[PDB]
Amino acid sequence: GKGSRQCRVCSSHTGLIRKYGLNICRQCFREKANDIGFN
Amino acid sequence: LRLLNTNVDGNIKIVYALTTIKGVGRRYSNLVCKKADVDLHKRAGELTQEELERIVQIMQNPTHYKIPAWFLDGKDYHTLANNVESKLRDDLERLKKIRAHRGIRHFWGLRVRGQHTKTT
Amino acid sequence: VTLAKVIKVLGRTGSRGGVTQVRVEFLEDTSRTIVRNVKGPVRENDI
Amino acid sequence: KKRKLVADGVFYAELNEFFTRELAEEGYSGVEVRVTPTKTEVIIRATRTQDVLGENGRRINELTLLVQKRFKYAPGTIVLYAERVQDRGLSAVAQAESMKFKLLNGLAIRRAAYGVVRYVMESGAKGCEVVVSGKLRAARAKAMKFADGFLIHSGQPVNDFIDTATRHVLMRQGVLGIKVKIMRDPAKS
Amino acid sequence: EIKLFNKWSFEEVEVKDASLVDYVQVRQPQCPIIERLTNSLMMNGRNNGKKLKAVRIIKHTLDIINVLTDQNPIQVVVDAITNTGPREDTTRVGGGGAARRQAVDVSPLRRVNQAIALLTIGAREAAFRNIKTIAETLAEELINAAKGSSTSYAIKKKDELERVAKSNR
Amino acid sequence: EEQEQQQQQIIKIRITLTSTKVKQLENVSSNIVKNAEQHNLVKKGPVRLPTKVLKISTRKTPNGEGSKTWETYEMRIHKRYIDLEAPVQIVKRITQITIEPGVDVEVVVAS
Amino acid sequence: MPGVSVRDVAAQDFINAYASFLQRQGKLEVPGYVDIVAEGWFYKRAASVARHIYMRKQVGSINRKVLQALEKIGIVEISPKGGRRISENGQRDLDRIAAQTLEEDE
Amino acid sequence: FGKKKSATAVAHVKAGKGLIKVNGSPITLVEPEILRFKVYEPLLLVGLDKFSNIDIRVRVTGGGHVSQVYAIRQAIAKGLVAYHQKYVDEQSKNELKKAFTSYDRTLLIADSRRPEPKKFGGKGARSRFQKSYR
Amino acid sequence: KRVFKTHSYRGVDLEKLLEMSTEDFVKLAPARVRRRFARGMTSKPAGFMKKLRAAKLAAPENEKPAPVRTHMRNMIIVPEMIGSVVGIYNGKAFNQVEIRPEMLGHYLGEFSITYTPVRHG
RNA sequence: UAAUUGCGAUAACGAACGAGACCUUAACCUACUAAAUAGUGGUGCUAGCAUUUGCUGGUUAUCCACUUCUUAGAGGGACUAUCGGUUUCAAGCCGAUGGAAGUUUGAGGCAAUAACAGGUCUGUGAUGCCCUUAGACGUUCUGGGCCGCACGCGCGCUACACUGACGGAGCCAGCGAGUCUAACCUUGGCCGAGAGGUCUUGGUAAUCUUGUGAAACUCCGUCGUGCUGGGGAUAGAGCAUUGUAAUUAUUGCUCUUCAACGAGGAAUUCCUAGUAAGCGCAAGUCAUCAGCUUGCGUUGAUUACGUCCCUGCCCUUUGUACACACC
Structure with missing residues (x-):
């Protein structure tokens, strides 16, 4: 109930995000903008 | 110009120089040196001997045996002053004994709490 | 801006003459005007 | 703001994946999904959507059905359909x-x-x-x-x-x- | 932006030796007329990092710096940055090693400026009179630059800069 | 009368279409609008709610070198509401029409 | 050109109090008393929550019922809003003192 | 009717009497004072043609202090000259105008400045943080 | 009024505090062991003390003492234990330490360093 | 010229990528499209002071209509625009008028071709290969640990105070963000010196909490340039608040202690205007935690003919062992 809460794409329990809930920017910073995250 | 024990203050406004009253401070000054019916406005060498008597009352009789204003199973609390350092040692001593990773640390000389000391 | 020439005005009828200026070891442009010593092209100016 | 985007960053790409793998033996090309009133519609554009679309039929109902349970909801809402890829060259x-x-x-x-x-x-x-x-x-x-x-x-x-x-x-x-x-x-x- | 007026409004339209006036209320060669100097006196005052109070500063510095032996205040302020600029200091050489430094103008707007933030400075550096009147140091020092426009008495380096760019010339 | 508005003030069967594109979707703003300038009630309803802009920033490149770069990307939710009729003794079919995919529709019909 | 009505700026608060805990009586039986900060003091705070008519009636724990005195006299209602409207003695009991202050400048 | 560098002042125009209230006050007050003029200096500024008139006044509000002050500024004379003819001057309203803007910068339209922009850097904007790797 | 707030110390505390009857818990005082903030305790209670209990004692053996070890730097200054010996670990430690009532101070695993090695100074 | 950006030369001629253009943002406008309407301003009901009414204010009722204001759709708008100067052979440069805007609109995103063995199997259920197996380098569970402090180097935070600190008072910002559980965002009532406890409460677009308690800042008053009342390190006690857990360090509050530090060597950082600089808040972080960071508004400079030299880069020419190319 704290620092452990996976990250959908690759469990990499370190770096996950806010509005969404997946992440990490790991599996976002090119695998989201079209998934989507425009810009 | 010479209150509470060795404490020999003066020259600097009522309830302001009563901080230089080793032990006494920015609110003690007010509350104490105020409930004295003492005109906080009043200054240094000038002050009612009935004051100082009483400023040593409230602000050193409440601010000593009381903090119960100045009159009437006690417990109860209390502060310190020129009997401060002594008691400090007292408690750093109550500690210097049963041993505290943040107590024996007063003896040894590391900072007491938190203190990510590995720089300053 | 080495003060150019000093074309004053007659004799005692000139609070002060004028003087063009530009630069050699820096700038370079047309000018004149503000200064009333009495040096010369021997002396110089800055830009 | 809840779903919307998040809802895409959800089931969308999250789909794309199974719509990228376990299907490439047939060659996928993308996917678009929307719904009417609880009418969730997959639009799997395939290069060779044949048996890839229903060998006797099992293709869809098979996958499609999985794609239901998996990203779990539907029970009848989700529903998928094989389209005809663009003129290959591209996408x-x-x-x-x-x-x-x-x-x-x-x-x-x-x-x-x-x-x-x-x-x-x-x-x-x-x-x-x-x-x-x-x-x-x-x-x-x-x-x-x-x-x-x-x-x-x-x-x-x-x-x-x-x-x-x-x-x-x-x-x-x-x-x-x-x-x-x-x-x-x-x-x- | 963003000062005031009145308070005396003694507008001496003369006092402007050398060039200057052709830029006594200017900036250009690089502003325009950044309100008749006293918009920069008041501005060169923002040496903590924010105008206003700065604005006050100026004003107080004024009523003060005129009340005290009035010279029309504004004309003390003009006649402040007036007889109180640099005039052909040196500036490096490169012709050596190990330079030397030769001298000359003094691009007017300079003379005004380089004396503006300067008188400004001498002010700022209270420490005499280390009173509590910022506008006093700002005045007197500027006043000791109007009355001081009778030697020395606050500027000083005023001279220095010039009373030096003669020898090493 | 002191309020960017206060949306809302929502009508008329509510029908707020809330989406994430524009022309290629909110074309069905003209649609739904003019699809009623025929006979339909008074439609005080082409209410634009303001550009909602969700933005996720996240400095660039896994790892450590660089400067870290820092790219901050967006994905903007826009969403408006139309006021057809309130309940209307004329409904149905005029109950959820059109279908520009990716725009999210709205019922209600009050009050 | 011009006036103030309930307005008149600052001293118009260095008034309602200047004439509250001066023309006392009172409500401000405040028991928070001495320990809490400052000076004199603190009907000023009240000549604050006072001018707090312009607002809340349409926009710490000393405060937490420094309201309780205003609402026991100089307006300050339970407000169906949820705060305090300048009660009976309205922009009135105030408006007055404000007047007094007005002609009091000279 | 006029906003100022993140601030914004609204214009009231229809002939009346004295006491022109800003926000809901009186351009006597306007207490973020010091330079409390430059507000009373639009009305004063009427020093060029008129003396005060006999009209109206409205409220401002946006961004912060001196911002607002500078806003209420245009606000006024950017509303004396109000069209007209019921506000400005029923003819040749360049009466004020060209006069109330032959030394203006408030009614003299607004300034093309407005806060924004930073940088993947330090503070941002342009001031990029101070680093000195060895 | 006319003080009571905070004046340096105190209360009848440290001094007249937990010390208030050094023979207090010599009677109990159980929850009363908690008669002095600022900590404890949204729960109540434990169980492992059953060894310090009918084991640490239970003979007597008038040469008082006992093993009684348990990783538990959580277990707070009893003081219903009053005196015994517990294995105040540090990982590879379980160091020994009497539980003298004299000091119902800090936490079990507290009076038994896990640095122990400040290094040359 | 910001540009291999153009002109100009000319055995070249004609051209594609890149730059540009276009995308986004920030500004202006329409008297187009309505919105509640910022209400521009009026209507009823209503409270207050005051001979029209100002001076106000609430408030649910019908009105309206449209700027303020607002939201955002669809277009317009700038194109170095005139004019003059002057390179003259023009691209341009420049000064003045003057536009919301001035020659590059401010800003950002995209960013070709080559190059580095740059850094990332500690971000992937990306992977070669090697290693590793019921005494496991797998995964778990319990405890410390990354926080251990003679000392070095760096990014900072706040301070040396009179443009100040200190108490009362005045005001007003923007980006933003948040629940089905449930300790989401939190208004209001009470209790609480304070932390906070709290009874309720609104609220998946501007609806409710934030602009209506931002701070720097303005005014009024106290301190007397004295390591004071600047500053607040360190420790003494206590009270509360996150979590199973806070001793090991934990977050806030309450008293007392009160040190360095009297503007900083040699170096070196960064920036030319809605900048710099100061002041602050939102968001990421999250149960709790910001001295970080991305942002965002608030006040609000001084500076220039610039090219001179030190540093970098480039373009040629010029020399050249090589050319896996001066590792």
Whole structure:
């Protein structure tokens, strides 16, 4: 109930995000903008 | 110009120089040196001997045996002053004994709490 | 801006003459005007 | 704000995946889904949507049904349907799924790609690049290109044609990695 | 932006030796007329990092710096930055090693400026009179630059800069 | 009368179409609008709610070198509401029409 | 050109108090008393929550019922809003003192 | 009717009497004072043609202090000259105008400045943080 | 009023505090062991003390003492234990330490360093 | 010229990428499209002081209509625009008028071709190969640990105070963000010196909490340039608040202690205007935690003919062992 809460794409329990809930920017910073995250 | 024990203050406004009253401070000054019916406005060498008597009352009789204003199973609390350092040692001593990773640390000389000391 | 020439005005009828200026070891442009010593092209100016 | 985007960053791409794998034996090309009133509709655009679309039928109901339970909801809401891919040449995953499956299959990745190049371009499309950037046979590491046409990934809005994407390339020696590009719309629709 | 007026409004339209006036209320060669100087006196005052109070500063410095032996205040302020600029200091050489430094103008707007933030400075550096009147140091020092326009008495380096760029010339 | 508005003030069967594109969706703003300038009630309802812009920033490149770069990307939710009729003794069919996919529709019909 | 009505700026608060805990009586039986900060003091705070008519009636724990005195006299209602309206003695009991202050400038 | 560098002042125009209230006050007050003029200096500024008139007054509000002050500024004379003819001057309203802007910068339209922009850097904007790797 | 707030110390504390009857818990005082903030305790209670209990004692053996070890730097200054010996670990430690009532101070695993090695100074 | 940006030369001629253009943002406008309407301003009901009414204010009722204001759709708008100067052969440069805007609108995103063995198997259920197996380098569970402090180097935070600190008072910002559980965002009532406890409460677009308690800042008053009342390190006690857990360090509050530090060597950082600089808040972080960071508004400079030299880069020419290319 704290620092452990996976990250959908690759469990990499370190770096996950806010509005969404997946992440990490790991599996976002090119695998989201079209998934989507425009810009 | 010479209150509470060795404490020999003066020259600097009522309830302001009563901080230089080793032990006494920015609110003690007010509350104490105020409930004295003492005109906080009043200054240094000038002050009612009935004051100082009483400023040593409230602000050193409440601010000593009381903090119960100045009159009437006690417990109860209390502060310190020129009997401060002594008691400090007292408690750093109550500690210097049963041993505290943040107590024996007063003896040894590391900072007491938190203190990510590995720089300053 | 080495003060150019000093074309004053007659004799005692000139609070002060004028003087063009530009630069050699820096700038370079047309000018004149503000200064009333009495040096010369021997002396110089800055830009 | 809840779902919306998040809802896409959800079931959308999250779909894309199963719509990228467990289906590539048939060659996927994307996917679009919307719903009427609890009418969740997958629109799986396939290159070879045949049995890939219903060998006696089992394709869809099989997958489709999984795609239900999986991303769990539907029970009748979700519903999928096989479309007919565009004129292959483009949408990246086309000839990239190709090479991806070619060097893979066997062809010398010399002219192997020289094809997809000279074939996307061939299906009419002002040329198109596609470098192979793996461990070029036994050796160190490097890459090589392949193009002829136009483009330059400049600020033509979102390229505004350039429809490039990269894929796996998991050979037994390492991981080369395919990445084609297309000059796309020479101005049409 | 962003000062006031009145308070005296003694507008001496003369006092402007050398060039100057052709830029006594200017900036250009690089502003325009950044309100008749006293918009920069008041501005060169923002040496903590924010105008206003700065604005006050100026004003107080004024009523004060005129009340005290009035010279029309504004004309003390003009006649402040007036007889109180640099005039052809040196500036490096490069012709040596190990330079030397030769001298000359003094691009007017300079003379005004380089004396503006300067008188400004001498002010700022209270420490005499280390009173509590910022506008006093700002005045007197500027006043000791009006009355001081009778030697020395606050500027000083005023001279220095010039009373030096003669020898090493 | 002191309020950017206060949306809302929502009508008329509510029908708020809330989406993430524009022309290629909110074309069905003209649609739904003019699809009623015929006979339909008074439609005080082409209410634009303001550009909602969700933005996720996240400095660039896994790892450590660089400067870290820092790219901050977007994905903007726009969303408006139309006021057809309130309940209307004329409904149905005029109950959820059109279908520009990716725009999210709205019922209610009050009050 | 011009006036103030309930307005008149600052001293118009250095008034309602200047004439509250001066023309006392009172409510401000405040027992928070001495310990809490400052000076004199603190009907000023009240000549604050006072001018707090312009607002809340349409826009710490000393405060937490420094309201309780105003609402026991100089307006300050339970407000169906949820705060305090300048009660009976309205922009009135105030408006007055404000007047007094007005002609009191001279 | 006029906003100022993140602030914004609204204009009231229809002939009346004295006491022109800003916000809901009186351009006597306007207490973020010091330079409390430059507000009473639009009305004063009427020093060029008129003396005060006999009209109206409205409220401002946006961004912060001196911002607002500078806003209410245009606000006024950017509303004396109000069209007219019921506000400005029923003819040749360049009466004020060209006069109330032959030394203006408030009614003299607004300034093309407005806060924004930073940088993947330090503070941002342009001041990029101070680093000195060895 | 006219003080009571905070004046340096105190209360009848440290001094007249837990010390308030050094023979207090010599009677119990159980929850009363908690008669002095600022900590404890949204729960109540434990169980492992059953060894310090009918084991640490239980003979007597008038040479008072006992093993009684348990990783538990959580277990707070009893003081219903009053005196015994517990294995105040540090990982590879379980160091020994009497539980003298004299000091119902800090936490079990507190009076038994896990640095122990400040290094040359 | 910001540009291999153009002119100009000319055996070249004609051209594609890149720059540009276009995308986004920030500004202006329409008297187009309505919105509640910022109400521009009026209507009823209503409270207050005051001979019209100002001076106000509430408030649910019908009105309206449209700027303020607002939201955002669809277009317009700038193009170095005139004019003059002057390179003259023009691209341009420049000064003045003057536009919301001035020659590069401010800003950002995209960013070709080559190059580095740069850094990332500690971000992937990306992977070659090597290693590793019921005494496991797998995963778990318990405890410490990354926080251990003679000392070095760096990014900072706040301070040396009179443009100040200190108490009362005046005001007003923007980006933003948040629940089905449930300790989401939190208004209001009470209790609480304070932390906070709290009874309720609104609220998946501007609806409710934030602009209506931002701070720097303005005014009024106290301190007397004295390591004071600047500053607040360190420790003494206590009270509360996150979590199973806070001793090992934990977050806030309450008293007392009160040190360095009297503007900083040699170096060196960064920036030319809605900048710099100061002041602050939202968001990421999250149970709790910001001295970080991305942002965002608030006040609100001084500076220039610039090219001179030190540093970098470039372009040629010029020399050249090589050319896996001066590792």
